[PDB]
């Protein structure tokens, strides 16, 4: 919410790197150079295929939460939402974009 | 015995207790508004209002009010009572 005077849902991609830099190592990244770790790890996870500068807030932290615990590789992305739809409460159609 | 009753949440087919509380908060959230102002002439004062030195200065300003509010005692001197009235005006003025 720091970069948004009003929420409006989405921000531009230029502030994505600065968003992850100011986070603690227990949640963000290490104290070394972000280019060697943070920049390379940014593409490693799964992201929605939206426009150049249209990313929603819930599509950013969800990847971080998925990275913190039970990290999974490619090939079983739909298994993640399958686990949520079988244990977690009702999704209320809000995980459609986050599914991919 | 109460705690053992709360153990029956057997949704741990793949997730642990740590994942139980973090996931639900993520699924139900909405960003708030920072209310950053505009119109520079109005924005000029926003720097003074929203700044670390300003709130730090008022942090000890409130503390000194508490020290003043605790110094009243039984049968205090007339000069002490007079010194308290002006100190009350000074603090209420700056808070106003």
Rounded CA separation A16/A53 (Å): 10
Closest of A41, A87, A95 to residue A64, by C-alpha: A41
Rounded CA separation A25/A40 (Å): 16
Tell how far CA A92 is from the center of its chain: 20
What does B13-81 look like in DSSP terms, one character per residue? SS--HHHHHHHHHHHS----------SHHHHHHHHHHSSHHHHHHHHHHHHHHHHHHH---TT--HHHH
Opening angle at CA A63, ends A28 and A41, nearest 5: 55
* Residues in CB range of B20: below 8 A, 6 or more apart: B9, B11, B12
Cα dihedral B48, B50, B52, B57 in deg (nearest 10)? 60
> A55 pairs with which residues across the strands?
A11
A84 to B18: CB separation less than 8 angstroms, yes or no: no
Please tell me the distance in Å from A1's CA to the nearest CA on chain B: 6
Rounded CA separation A88/A81 (Å): 9
A83 to B15: CB separation less than 8 angstroms, yes or no: yes
Q: Judge whether A80 and A45 are in contact, CB under 8 Å.
A: no
Structure resolution, Å: 3.0
Burial class (CB in 10 A: 0-12, 13-18, 19+), B91: middle
**Token digits for A80?**
């993640």
Rounded CA separation B11/A86 (Å): 9
Method of determination used here? cryo-EM
What does A28-66 look like in DSSP terms, one character per residue? S--SS-TTTTHHHHHHHS------TT-EETHHHHHHHHH
Rounded CA separation B23/A68 (Å): 12
Task: Please tell me the number of Cα atoms within 13 Å of B41 on its side-chain side.
Answer: 0
Rounded CA separation B27/B20 (Å): 12
Rounded CA separation B92/B19 (Å): 49
Q: Judge whether B20 and B11 are in contact, CB under 8 Å.
A: yes
3-state secondary structure of A11: strand
3-state secondary structure of A10: strand
Please tell me the distance in Å from A75's CA to the nearest CA on chain B: 18
Burial class (CB in 10 A: 0-12, 13-18, 19+), B19: buried
Closest of A55, A68, A69 to residue A97, by C-alpha: A55
Burial class (CB in 10 A: 0-12, 13-18, 19+), A91: middle
């Amino acid at each position: 919410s720091e970069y948004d005077p009003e929420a409006k849902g989405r921000i531009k991609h230029l502030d994505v790197v600065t968003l992850l830099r100011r986070i603690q190592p227990p949640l963000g990244f290490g104290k070394l150079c972000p280019h060697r770790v943070a920049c390379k790890r940014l593409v490693a996870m799964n992201m929605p295929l939206n426009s150049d500068g249209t990313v929603m807030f819930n599509a950013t932290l969800f990847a971080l939460v998925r990275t913190a615990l039970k990290i999974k590789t490619e090939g079983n992305l739909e298994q993640a939402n399958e686990e949520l739809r079988a244990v977690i409460k009702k999704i209320w159609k809000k995980t459609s974009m986050k599914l991919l | 015995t109460f705690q053992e009753q709360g153990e029956k949440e057997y949704k741990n087919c793949e997730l642990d207790k740590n994942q139980r509380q973090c996931v639900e908060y993520a699924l139900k959230a909405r960003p708030l508004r920072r209310y950053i102002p505009k119109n520079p002439y109005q924005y000029k004062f926003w720097y003074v209002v929203n700044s670390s030195p300003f709130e730090y200065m008022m942090f000890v300003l409130i503390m000194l009010n508490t020290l003043c509010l605790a110094m009243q005692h039984y049968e205090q001197s007339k000069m002490f009572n007079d010194a308290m009235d002006i100190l009350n005006m000074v603090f209420t003025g700056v808070f106003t």
